[PDB]
Fold dihydropteroate synthase.
Amino acid sequence: MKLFAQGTSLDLSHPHVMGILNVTPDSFSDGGTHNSLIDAVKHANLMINAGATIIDVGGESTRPGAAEVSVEEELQRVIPVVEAIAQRFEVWISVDTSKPEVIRESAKVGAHIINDIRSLSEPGALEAAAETGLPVCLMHMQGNPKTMQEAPKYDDVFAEVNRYFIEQIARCEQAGIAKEKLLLDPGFGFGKNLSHNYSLLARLAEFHHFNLPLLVGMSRKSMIGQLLNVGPSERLSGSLACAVIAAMQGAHIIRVHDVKETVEAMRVVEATLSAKENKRYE
């Protein structure tokens, strides 16, 4: 499968490692852009050289209890960074933003994929996304992403994620976005407890029936911290194990913090699927 955006293509024949670049008010320091723009570009550079092919630029934290960011705060931080990256490098760039104006402006400076945690649910976001013509990633979640309150109960979490994606592909089609520009994300860690998360990971090979690319982001999350009982920085081994289980089942983009190590794990996976009579574990 190939994605086309901004006069380029991304070939999803082999797994892609997507780096994380968050430029929130609390990390893209001291007011609305300091010299944190060369930090962001240094950081971009390291990830590309460690082998990342996509970079996910977001201006709003998605963690429990995270602050809301205003449109100006996001325009101020995200658009500088997306622009400077696209000028200097070959990488594909996706933007995680929920706001229509940030979608429109990030298209204008060279963003390739709109990767919104809220799946374009805000007023005018679908419309803006559609207008840009860019690839959009749809993500399951139940509730508000940044709540600090307990995980849903589901009749069946796999059945519910699957029926959510059928509903969102339709909505997007009704707004003129072709199915061919969609990517799907089960949304690990968002509205799911530890059991729900491993159920979705165990059955990731089943979401290929949509015949859409799968983007996955399990890096350093609670499904790893709770299972092993370790804090956020001692989660590498467990994050690499989730990355490999996902790629063995055919996930096309893996969103991680440790780019070097995951690229190395992905090489072993590729060498292995290359030798497999059907390029996927089921």
